Design a protein around this motif. Sequence first.
Motif, PDB file in Angstrom:
ATOM      1  N   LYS A 116      50.074  -8.226 -29.222  1.00  0.00           N
ATOM      2  CA  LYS A 116      49.975  -7.041 -28.359  1.00  0.00           C
ATOM      3  C   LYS A 116      50.526  -5.787 -29.036  1.00  0.00           C
ATOM      4  O   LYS A 116      51.220  -5.871 -30.060  1.00  0.00           O
ATOM      5  CB  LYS A 116      50.675  -7.284 -27.005  1.00  0.00           C
ATOM      6  N   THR A 117      50.193  -4.633 -28.463  1.00  0.00           N
ATOM      7  CA  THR A 117      50.754  -3.350 -28.887  1.00  0.00           C
ATOM      8  C   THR A 117      51.426  -2.618 -27.710  1.00  0.00           C
ATOM      9  O   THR A 117      51.218  -2.967 -26.544  1.00  0.00           O
ATOM     10  CB  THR A 117      49.686  -2.442 -29.562  1.00  0.00           C
TER      11      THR A 117
ATOM     12  N   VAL B 224      58.725  -4.496 -23.509  1.00  0.00           N
ATOM     13  CA  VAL B 224      57.738  -5.523 -23.790  1.00  0.00           C
ATOM     14  C   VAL B 224      58.290  -6.800 -23.193  1.00  0.00           C
ATOM     15  O   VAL B 224      59.370  -7.256 -23.599  1.00  0.00           O
ATOM     16  CB  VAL B 224      57.454  -5.695 -25.323  1.00  0.00           C
TER      17      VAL B 224
ATOM     18  N   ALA C 194      55.100  -8.184 -30.405  1.00  0.00           N
ATOM     19  CA  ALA C 194      54.293  -6.953 -30.327  1.00  0.00           C
ATOM     20  C   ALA C 194      54.791  -5.858 -31.262  1.00  0.00           C
ATOM     21  O   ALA C 194      55.954  -5.876 -31.684  1.00  0.00           O
ATOM     22  CB  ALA C 194      54.236  -6.433 -28.885  1.00  0.00           C
TER      23      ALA C 194
END
Lengths: 181, 182
Positions: free
Chosen positions: A2-3, A46, A169
């Motif tokens: 993920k980002t 996150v 991430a």
Amino acid sequence: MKTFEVMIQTDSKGYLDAKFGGNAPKAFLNSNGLPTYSPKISWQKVEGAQSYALELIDHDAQKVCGMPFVHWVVGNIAHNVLEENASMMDKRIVQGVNSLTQGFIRSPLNESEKQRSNLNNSVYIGPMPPNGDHHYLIQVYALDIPKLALKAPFFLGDLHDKMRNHIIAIGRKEFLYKQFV
Amino acid sequence: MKTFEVMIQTDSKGYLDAKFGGNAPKAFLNSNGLPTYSPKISWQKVEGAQSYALELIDHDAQKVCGMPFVHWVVGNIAHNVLEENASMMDKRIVQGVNSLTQGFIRSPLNESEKQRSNLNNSVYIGPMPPNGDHHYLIQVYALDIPKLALKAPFFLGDLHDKMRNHIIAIGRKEFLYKQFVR
């Protein structure tokens, strides 16, 4: 993988304030005229993360000196923010050796002076671009572990060694800083 | 902002084959002893990508010389793959200056020599890690425009200027290469 979004306050044109780099008023430079006053940087939480790490890199420095320049490396960030002036003030984070160092392995200084120079340079050094305005890349890593086994002096690849297999991430963000002098 | 998978053939242990970094057999070096034989690198196709670009960096160099080292910079990749020996053979890609260059501003060399050095080093230069095995980082960008406005000699910073606001995804992959001795 993920980002996530990364933020830093710049002006309308995307420039970080003079005080964070070479053009700083003298009062924001250290004894030797170096911009050591780090900006507030923050990012989305996150889920799953237990610490974050951060590297700040100048790609535009390759043209200037053959390679990109390392401005800041920080690990053991417990929360999704680095508060303004964190480099001088934050005592929980652990900080890596920047590219002003003369303690890299092929340096002509002896082992002790290499060590002294590495610790000396284990801080944020601000933008100082000589050939014109530069973009700078903040990259933030979200980790699934609370603590990295890193002790100053450590280098960019040491961060990556301890981060390896623990990155859930990554977030990227660029900013500008005006030409210096 | 998406991510995608990037691939390179490695050891069971994660090492890229000697031939790609100058522990190489001399047949894979140039006449001056340099590892310019680039490895096959490929990645999953991304939706909307008109072109790709790649950079290859060694963070482990920072400890050795003070900065990470740029091994390869490439733009205008039309397909999701660079074939083996691409740096030498691919007519369609454009290549940036690597970190062997002595053409950076504030090199001692005169203006004309700098231009040569920059052009001469606008190619892949393989791992040559002196102090031990290093990890290398491959970063691939998926772009939303078919062609970047780049002409050799150009640096990593220039690659980024052209790609700014056009990146629709990024892919990352690491590999190992054995310490180089003589």
